[PDB]
Amino acid sequence: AKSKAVPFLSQPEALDGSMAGDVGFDPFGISSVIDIKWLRESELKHGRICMLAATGCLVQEVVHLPGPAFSQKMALNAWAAAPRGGMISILVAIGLIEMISNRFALTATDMFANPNRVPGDLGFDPLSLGANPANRARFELSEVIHGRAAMMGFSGMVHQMIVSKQAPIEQLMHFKAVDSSLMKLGGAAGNLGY
Amino acid sequence: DVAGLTPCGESKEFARRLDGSVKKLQTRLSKYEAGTPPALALQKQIDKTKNRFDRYGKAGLLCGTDGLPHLITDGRWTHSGEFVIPGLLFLYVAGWIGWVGRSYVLFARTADKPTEKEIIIDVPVALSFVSTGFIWPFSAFKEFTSGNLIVPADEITVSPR
Amino acid sequence: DFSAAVPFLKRPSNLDGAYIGDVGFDPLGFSDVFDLRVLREAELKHGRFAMLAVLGFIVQELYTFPFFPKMAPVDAHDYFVKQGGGSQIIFWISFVELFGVVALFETLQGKREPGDFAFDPLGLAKDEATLERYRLAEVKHARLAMIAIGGFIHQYWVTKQTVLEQLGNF
Amino acid sequence: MDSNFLKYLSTAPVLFTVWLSFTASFIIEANRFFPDMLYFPM
Amino acid sequence: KKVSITVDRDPVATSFEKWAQPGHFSRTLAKGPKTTTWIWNLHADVHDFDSHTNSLEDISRKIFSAHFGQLSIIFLWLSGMYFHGARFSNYSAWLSNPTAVKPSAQVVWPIVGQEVLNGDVGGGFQGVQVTSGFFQIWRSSGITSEVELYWCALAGLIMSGLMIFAGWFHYHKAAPKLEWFQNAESMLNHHLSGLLGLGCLSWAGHQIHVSLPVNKLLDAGVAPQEIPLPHEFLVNRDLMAQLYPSFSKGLVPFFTLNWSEYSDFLTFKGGLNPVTGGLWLSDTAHHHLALAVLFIVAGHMYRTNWGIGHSMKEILEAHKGPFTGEGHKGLYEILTTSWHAQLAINLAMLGSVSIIVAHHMYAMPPYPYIATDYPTQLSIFTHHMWIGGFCVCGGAAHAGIFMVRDYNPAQNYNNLLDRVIRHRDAIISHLNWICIFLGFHSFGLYIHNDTMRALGRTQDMFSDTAIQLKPVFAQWVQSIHTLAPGNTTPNALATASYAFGGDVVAVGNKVAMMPISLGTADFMVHHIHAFTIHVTVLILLKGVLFSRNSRLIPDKANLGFRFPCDGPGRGGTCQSSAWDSVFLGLFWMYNCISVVIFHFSWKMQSDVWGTVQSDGTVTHITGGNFAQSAITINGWLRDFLWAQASQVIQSYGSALSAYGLIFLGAHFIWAFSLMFLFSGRGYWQELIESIVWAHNKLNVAPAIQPRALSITQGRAVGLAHYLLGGIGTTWAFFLARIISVG
Amino acid sequence: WVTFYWHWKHITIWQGNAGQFNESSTYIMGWLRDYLWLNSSPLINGYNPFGMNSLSVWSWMFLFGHLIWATGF
Numbered sequence A: 001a002k003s004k005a006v007p008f009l010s011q012p013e014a015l016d017g018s019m020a021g022d023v024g025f026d027p028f029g030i031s032s033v034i035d036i037k038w039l040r041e042s043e044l045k046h047g048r049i050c051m052l053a054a055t056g057c058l059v060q061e062v063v064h065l066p067g068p069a070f071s072q073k074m075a076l077n078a079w080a081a082a083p084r085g086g087m088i089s090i091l092v093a094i095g096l097i098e099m100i101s102n103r104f105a106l107t108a109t110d111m112f113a114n115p116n117r118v119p120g121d122l123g124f125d126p127l128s129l130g131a132n133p134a135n136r137a138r139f140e141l142s143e144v145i146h147g148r149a150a151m152m153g154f155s156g157m158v159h160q161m162i163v164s165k166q167a168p169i170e171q172l173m174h175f176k177a178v179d180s181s182l183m184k185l186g187g188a189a190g191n192l193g194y
Numbered sequence B: 001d002v003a004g005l006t007p008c009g010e011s012k013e014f015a016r017r018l019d020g021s022v023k024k025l026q027t028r029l030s031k032y033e034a035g036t037p038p039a040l041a042l043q044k045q046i047d048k049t050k051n052r053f054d055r056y057g058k059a060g061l062l063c064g065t066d067g068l069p070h071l072i073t074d075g076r077w078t079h080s081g082e083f084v085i086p087g088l089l090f091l092y093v094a095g096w097i098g099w100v101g102r103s104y105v106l107f108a109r110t111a112d113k114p115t116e117k118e119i120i121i122d123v124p125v126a127l128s129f130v131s132t133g134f135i136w137p138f139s140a141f142k143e144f145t146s147g148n149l150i151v152p153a154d155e156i157t158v159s160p161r
Numbered sequence C: 001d002f003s004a005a006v007p008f009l010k011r012p013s014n015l016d017g018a019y020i021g022d023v024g025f026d027p028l029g030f031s032d033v034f035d036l037r038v039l040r041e042a043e044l045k046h047g048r049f050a051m052l053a054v055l056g057f058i059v060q061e062l063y064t065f066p067f068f069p070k071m072a073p074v075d076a077h078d079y080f081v082k083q084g085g086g087s088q089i090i091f092w093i094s095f096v097e098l099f100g101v102v103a104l105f106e107t108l109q110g111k112r113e114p115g116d117f118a119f120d121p122l123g124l125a126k127d128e129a130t131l132e133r134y135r136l137a138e139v140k141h142a143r144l145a146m147i148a149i150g151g152f153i154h155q156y157w158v159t160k161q162t163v164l165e166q167l168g169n170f
Numbered sequence D: 001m002d003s004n005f006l007k008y009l010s011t012a013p014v015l016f017t018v019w020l021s022f023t024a025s026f027i028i029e030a031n032r033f034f035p036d037m038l039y040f041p042m
Numbered sequence E: 001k002k003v004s005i006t007v008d009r010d011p012v013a014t015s016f017e018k019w020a021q022p023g024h025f026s027r028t029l030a031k032g033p034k035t036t037t038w039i040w041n042l043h044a045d046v047h048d049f050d051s052h053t054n055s056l057e058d059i060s061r062k063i064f065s066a067h068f069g070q071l072s073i074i075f076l077w078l079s080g081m082y083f084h085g086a087r088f089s090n091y092s093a094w095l096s097n098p099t100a101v102k103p104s105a106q107v108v109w110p111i112v113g114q115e116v117l118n119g120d121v122g123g124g125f126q127g128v129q130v131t132s133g134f135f136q137i138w139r140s141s142g143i144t145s146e147v148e149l150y151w152c153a154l155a156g157l158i159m160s161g162l163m164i165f166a167g168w169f170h171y172h173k174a175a176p177k178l179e180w181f182q183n184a185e186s187m188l189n190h191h192l193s194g195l196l197g198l199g200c201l202s203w204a205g206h207q208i209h210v211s212l213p214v215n216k217l218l219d220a221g222v223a224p225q226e227i228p229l230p231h232e233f234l235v236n237r238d239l240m241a242q243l244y245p246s247f248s249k250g251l252v253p254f255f256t257l258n259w260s261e262y263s264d265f266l267t268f269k270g271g272l273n274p275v276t277g278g279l280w281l282s283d284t285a286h287h288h289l290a291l292a293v294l295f296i297v298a299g300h301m302y303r304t305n306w307g308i309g310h311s312m313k314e315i316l317e318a319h320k321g322p323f324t325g326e327g328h329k330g331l332y333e334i335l336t337t338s339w340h341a342q343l344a345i346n347l348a349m350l351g352s353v354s355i356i357v358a359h360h361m362y363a364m365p366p367y368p369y370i371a372t373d374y375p376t377q378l379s380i381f382t383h384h385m386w387i388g389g390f391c392v393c394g395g396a397a398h399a400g401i402f403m404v405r406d407y408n409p410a411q412n413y414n415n416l417l418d419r420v421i422r423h424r425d426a427i428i429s430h431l432n433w434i435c436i437f438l439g440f441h442s443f444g445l446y447i448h449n450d451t452m453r454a455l456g457r458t459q460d461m462f463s464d465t466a467i468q469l470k471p472v473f474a475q476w477v478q479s480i481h482t483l484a485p486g487n488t489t490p491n492a493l494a495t496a497s498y499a500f501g502g503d504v505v506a507v508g509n510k511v512a513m514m515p516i517s518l519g520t521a522d523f524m525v526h527h528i529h530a531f532t533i534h535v536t537v538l539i540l541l542k543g544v545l546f547s548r549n550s551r552l553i554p555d556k557a558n559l560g561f562r563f564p565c566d567g568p569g570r571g572g573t574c575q576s577s578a579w580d581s582v583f584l585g586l587f588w589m590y591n592c593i594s595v596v597i598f599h600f601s602w603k604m605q606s607d608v609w610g611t612v613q614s615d616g617t618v619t620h621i622t623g624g625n626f627a628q629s630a631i632t633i634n635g636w637l638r639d640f641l642w643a644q645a646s647q648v649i650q651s652y653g654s655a656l657s658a659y660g661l662i663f664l665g666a667h668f669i670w671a672f673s674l675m676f677l678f679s680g681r682g683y684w685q686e687l688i689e690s691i692v693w694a695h696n697k698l699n700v701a702p703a704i705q706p707r708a709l710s711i712t713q714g715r716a717v718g719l720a721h722y723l724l725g726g727i728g729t730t731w732a733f734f735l736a737r738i739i740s741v742g
Numbered sequence F: 001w002v003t004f005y006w007h008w009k010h011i012t013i014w015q016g017n018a019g020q021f022n023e024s025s026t027y028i029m030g031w032l033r034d035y036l037w038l039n040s041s042p043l044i045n046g047y048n049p050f051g052m053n054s055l056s057v058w059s060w061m062f063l064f065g066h067l068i069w070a071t072g073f
């Protein structure tokens, strides 16, 4: 009746606890509006992108593909540094992978229409780490939590790069308190523009 | 260059436009003291004007005899960023809006009260539809070839004539 | 029928002892016009802010974190406003308040008590009886603290003395 | 939140006003950060 | 005690359920849309309460709470005007230099280059110049600081919250019964005594204790932050007796009837204050005190609960003579059972009062420094002429709604209404003849002059230098008013207004007011005014008198107030309803008010406003061309519209470029209206059929079947866009012209 | 629209000032002030309180045209 995550709120509907990482944390009631399968597929995919993204920013500073173009320590700087044609090629590769993996089930209306389709289940298991049912639940639990943690970490790492124009590891190695004189929050309305 | 036009970066009339636009702001600035809010407002407007003229000069736009940029829209690729690419962006957005609106009117026909779904919109379903529009070219052409976009002439009411 | 708190005045008719702290004091009559659940949640929220604030005023005079410069608490507001530290506090308070809106809806449906956020980390309230004592006490502390807040904010305005120093002085 | 108040917010004039205010608003913001875009920059 | 308070408790439940059910209020609309007409029908009939409900009680309750909703909106609007003056204005700079700084209380954000609208209004400030005259109001009130403007803004917000609460409370919690609303004697007693009388008395008290000392110090030359706060005048009676020594005697002269002690601050000066060009505030204080006295006296006339007083029914039924049958019998029952009859009267009177306000405020400028702020004088004259014309046409709209709906012949036998309806042919034929006579002999003089000037015959024109049509009666009245001080108003020191004659009042070398001479051009344009007013009366009166039946349609009342026609037979009965005479009379109101505001603008620029150079000579804005050029149509076209549109059309790239854009946009909307006015519904429904076909082809037809607008709605849309475009074109033209040159 | 375009383009060319059409024709205020308003002045001065000339008949026809058109309304 009362959510585990938030006791004063009532437990969200459409959350039965079947999915790993189901803690009843849906205060806004978004689950009622949007089907859980679409939300879980979104959550898992968003998290997987973030897991690679966080690891990538730290790895990009530590390791660079040979050549000046790949040498930028700060990942935001790396965005400009990398050859544009290759980046656009990556964008096309991501699109084609999305197209084949979903089996043309791209839209919210037509995704999950097939009964066997399961949230996040793109049938990607080349080495069959998850083939054993014994370890299936723990793998699912870890993947969902890693994704949530990664999203929080990536948001922090991007914004910390914005506040101080430093790569993530060096900010840990050499720490500067934000002066706060620069980049005051908003203020467009207050000073009547300009 | 094309059609006897001049690149805006070397047009003298473009340069006189930039200079006259800045003198007009500087004479308004000559009536205010340095740190006042009207002085900061006009100095930010002089920076915006100079930035715009600099960007236009280096963009490959062509100026006329009047010193204003002119747009070439005959299809040549050196000028596709003035009509062809904005036009492709528009048609992608417009076809999205049309595909999504059409999907909702077909959904609303199968409703308990079809006309109540159009003055009180089912917002979760309509948001399911707005998300689908990103692949409208493929969905709409497959809709067309599978005989579900176009209805035959004999299921359409017409005037007696 | 007459109100217990004030004998001459009449019992409001929505104040029947349903909510703890009821002494029948509602001369203006807002309880009749508006839902009492909203008002009780507002009373607890206003009181909790005030109870924290009076302690915060006193403690800030007693001890201050070294990194921030020592300032009078009433005038500290302006420094934090420019620094951005005050904006950080507002943002987090607003974020919790967003969940509070959902909780207000839970109260209106009947799933929540007016001021219950299920906060018992230290498990102070062992049983219903001690909780009853605490809820009446919380109401009294909130009401008194709402009076006490502005008690020395207004005194600060008349006399530029720290409330602790002012209490000892004169 | 009340289901009848949400059914009121789903009425055509409310959605039309909110959606076109949101639409007008990100056109305004895009022209604040990226002004004077006479052409697609290419 | 038959006048008593009676209330139903908790009548209507405060629920969001009917919010989710558009159209809940009528049986027709509550079953949902099937064509797009439903959508329009929803908005058209929503505040027509007596069309949804049969009972006068529920109608009255809905009206009372909707009046609280309107008050809540007005208080929010006033609070916003005070807040924009407090926060986004140059008010403080304007107080120091009222003659140099231009008032501005609106600042734009910089987005698409629109920050060019922040022009240099003066006082180290950039913003949109405002013309509502709020700065002069605030100086007359004695505000002197932005802090007091913040407190006025908060008082407005609190009043707005209390009015929206009162509307909710009095509809949903405690709704008065019909017998409460049907207390006309009590309502008049309280609204004369309480509302108007104590309103005037309380304002007189403020003028005496705050406006008079603060404005005496301001006009002496004291800086605004050097002036004592308004309560130090209330307490320190010595400081008040410095400025006005009569205050040394207190209230003993008031109570002992030795009123001539108070002549320091209760004067009868007349004329204008030479420093500010406004009315003496001692005169306004005495004026409001005297008006307060006789509004409180007038609110004791009618009988409520103690036997003293008049019965309004007895007064009405007793006034009957030999020409008028039963007389005013049955009028009390009409005006205490029909809201439309009351709204018809109150709208006609409120519109007339707004027209009087427009004339009296330009001629006797009440506020300090408003007479030489020419954009404000033109703005508030034009604004209150338009409010007056609209409200007068709504008075005839609701007289027609009464006649069609609330009129009952059984209760109106042989009284004044019955007799008007029984000789409406004699009324409408004589009015028709007057409108023809008066268009021929007013506009035909203009055509005679166009022809004579074009033919080279200037000795054959109606002009001052030719055949003269002098306004001798108006000139004679002006003579009497200049002779009145010391003669027929012996204790007055100056004339009521310098428009009648007398001196030139100059403030900051600009003319505040000066005699407005009347000549042949003034004779002609005053008969133009009488012609356009008589024709508007003809259209609206013919709609009211023939609203129920005609020789054409014998049963027009069964079709209603608003119907498009009764078919193409009888030759054609298009636009036969009473609604269609309001529709046609709003065009002629527009014509009338447009000529009035053009006459005012050209005459004031040509003969009143301008600059006073050395030797006392006055150089007017357009140099006295009215006299010899307002006598031809070519003169109005060339020397007024063409010459003075220079500022709107040259405004691009300046702070007045918004007016140039609105000038063009309103020209557009006006022209766009003619698509709806010259067209018919049948064409547009047949065009919509082919568009619907193209939607059926793509399987995207809507379930709410599209319709062409109704015949009445095509007329209403055409009229709305016509008025919006025409008034908007004049609004932009007037404001850019007078901001540049005045 | 056709004859306004033909006439404005030709009077600007015939004056020697084709650049006035070139710059002002791209917005509607250019058509309003530089064609209708600017060229009205010899026409509406065909008669005035200072005399008349041979353009007095067109100056009358101009007003005549405004009257009939509005009477059509």
Ligand code: CLA
Pocket (backbone or CB within 6 Å): A189, A192, D014, D017, D018, D021, E076, E077, E079, E080, E081, E083, E084, E088, E106, E107, E108, E109
């Ligand atoms: C009542 C008359 C009135 C008018 C006409 C204006 C007009 C204006 N004000 Mg002022 N203002 C007023 C009252 C008024 N104000 C009052 C009472 C206050 C005191 C609180 C203020 C305080 C104020 C400030 C502090 C500022 C303004 C500003 C402005 C300007 C821009 C406003 C804007 O774009 O924000 C738009 C803001 C939005 C959030 C957009 C909302 C759009 C939504 C979608 C409208 C929808 C309404 C909704 C659908 C209704 C139905 C409800 C729903 C349940 C169905 C504009 C000149 C600004 C200014 O001048 O800056 C220089 C500014 O900064 N106003």
Ligand code: CLA
Pocket (backbone or CB within 6 Å): E063, E064, E067, E068, E071, E180, E181, E183, E186, E187, E190, E191, E193, E194, E195
């Ligand atoms: C002294 C008594 C009094 C006063 C001041 C008013 C005032 C008003 N009545 Mg009336 N009314 C009265 C007695 C009174 N009424 C009685 C006895 C009846 C029963 C017969 C009615 C029945 C009645 C109806 C049926 C309607 C009104 C309406 C109105 C409003 C008209 C619009 C207007 O000018 O408001 C603007 C002018 C103002 C001055 C705004 C003032 C707002 C408050 C309410 C005024 C009084 C405040 C307070 C007494 C002053 C305190 C002073 C203090 C600071 C010292 C106005 C508020 C109409 C309306 O709009 O309803 C809301 C309406 O439809 N009244």
Ligand code: CLA
Pocket (backbone or CB within 6 Å): A048, A049, A051, A052, A055, A059, A119, A120, A121, A122, A123, A124, A125, A128, A129, A130, A131, A136, A139, A140, A142, A143, A146
């Ligand atoms: C460590 C987090 C983690 C975990 C526990 C899982 C677990 C799972 N995934 Mg997920 N996945 C991940 C990361 C993860 N994946 C990433 C990063 C991507 C791509 C961006 C994906 C993409 C993906 C898809 C598309 C699908 C799955 C599926 C599955 C399920 C079956 C496959 C399996 O058992 O893998 C077991 C996984 C592990 C035991 C951990 C992976 C660690 C590998 C062995 C080493 C990788 C090292 C790497 C190079 C990091 C660099 C180190 C750095 C310091 C430089 C299972 C629940 C399928 C499924 O059933 O969905 C529900 C499915 O359809 N995953």
Ligand code: CLA
Pocket (backbone or CB within 6 Å): B097, B098, B099, B100, B101, B102, B104, B121, B126, B127, B129, B130, E690, E691, E692, E694, E695, E698, E700
């Ligand atoms: C999304 C719904 C939709 C779709 C797919 C179409 C499709 C079409 N319309 Mg129709 N139309 C619509 C809505 C729609 N219309 C509405 C609401 C109106 C009333 C203003 C019209 C008025 C209209 C006219 C007058 C004409 C067309 C024409 C056309 C055709 C050519 C495209 C065109 O001219 O667009 C033109 C579009 C407009 C003029 C108005 C569109 C207004 C908005 C942008 C569309 C509605 C958005 C809607 C609210 C979607 C909400 C979705 C959400 C609930 C999920 C094509 C058959 C033309 C035709 O028959 O040519 C063959 C034609 O002459 N339409």
Ligand code: CLA
Pocket (backbone or CB within 6 Å): E078, E132, E133, E134, E137, E349, E350, E351, E353, E354, E357, E361, E380, E383, E384, E387
């Ligand atoms: C849509 C309606 C509308 C709007 C938007 C405005 C807008 C404006 N009016 Mg106008 N006005 C209107 C209708 C309207 N008026 C009508 C119908 C009347 C006739 C009663 C007037 C009479 C009027 C006067 C007399 C004055 C304005 C003024 C103003 C300006 C300042 C607003 C303000 O603070 O008032 C402030 C108003 C005052 C400080 C004094 C008002 C004194 C009157 C006599 C109060 C009467 C109230 C009473 C209840 C009405 C009884 C009506 C009677 C028939 C029984 C502003 C331009 C003022 C102005 O021009 O300032 C430059 C001004 O002095 N208005």
Ligand code: CLA
Pocket (backbone or CB within 6 Å): E043, E044, E045, E046, E047, E048, E049, E343, E347, E390, E391, E392, E393, E394, E395, E397, E398, E401, E561, E562, E579, E582, E583, E586, E720, E724
């Ligand atoms: C105190 C003033 C007052 C009051 C209370 C009423 C009240 C009423 N009138 Mg009356 N009326 C008034 C003034 C008033 N009117 C005036 C001044 C006029 C002259 C124009 C009329 C002319 C009139 C007619 C001709 C009719 C009414 C009708 C009605 C009734 C229906 C109202 C409705 O549902 O409209 C709903 C409201 C709307 C649809 C609003 C839209 C109206 C315009 C086009 C929008 C405003 C444009 C805006 C101000 C500017 C836009 C800016 C732009 C740049 C975007 C209602 C009893 C009707 C009826 O049948 O009564 C029985 C009717 O036929 N009235």
Ligand code: CLA
Pocket (backbone or CB within 6 Å): E432, E435, E436, E437, E438, E439, E440, E443, E444, E447, E535, E538, E539, E584, E587, E588, F067, F070, F071, F072, F073
């Ligand atoms: C410029 C346009 C124009 C003109 C001239 C008229 C003219 C007239 N309208 Mg119309 N009207 C117009 C626009 C116009 N209207 C528009 C746009 C609307 C839309 C709502 C209406 C709606 C309308 C209504 C609803 C009413 C009128 C009425 C009138 C008449 C007013 C009485 C009058 O002045 O008689 C005098 C005639 C004139 C001033 C016309 C000009 C004549 C001048 C002096 C020259 C005459 C030259 C001479 C005859 C030449 C002879 C020789 C020649 C034959 C060779 C008159 C016939 C009213 C009416 O008929 O009641 C009497 C009436 O009720 N009109």
Ligand SMILES: CCCCCCCCCCCCCCCC(=O)OC[C@H](COP(=O)(O)OC[C@@H](O)CO)OC(=O)CCCCCCCCCCCCCCC
Pocket (backbone or CB within 6 Å): A185, A186, A187, A188, A189, A190, A191, C087, C091
């Ligand atoms: C699950 C998703 C989680 C998202 C978490 C977001 C975290 C960051 C959010 C802000 C952190 C604190 C920043 C304070 C920042 C701050 O205080 O700056 C100030 C700025 C206004 O300026 P002021 O009036 O404060 O000027 C200050 C003066 O003192 C000096 O000029 O506030 C805003 O308006 C920003 C918000 C834009 C509002 C529109 C945003 C986009 C709207 C999209 C549609 C509406 C959706 C709902 C929006 C609420």
Ligand SMILES: CC1=C(C#C/C(C)=C/C=C/C(C)=C/C=C/C=C(C)/C=C/C=C(\C)C#CC2=C(C)C[C@@H](O)CC2(C)C)C(C)(C)C[C@H](O)C1
Pocket (backbone or CB within 6 Å): C051, C052, C054, C055, C119, C120, C121, C122, C123, C124, C125, C140, C141, C142, C144, C145, C147, C148, C149, C150, C151, C152, C155, C163, C166, C167
């Ligand atoms: C609930 C919850 C928990 C918790 C918690 C917390 C944070 C509890 C904190 C509670 C607090 C801070 C209570 C403070 C009340 C203050 C009052 C009533 C004011 C008194 C002042 C007066 C009367 C005065 C005065 C005066 C004036 C105005 C000015 C002077 O010149 C003079 C004078 C000094 C006389 C925990 C986490 C422990 C777990 C638990 O499971 C659940």
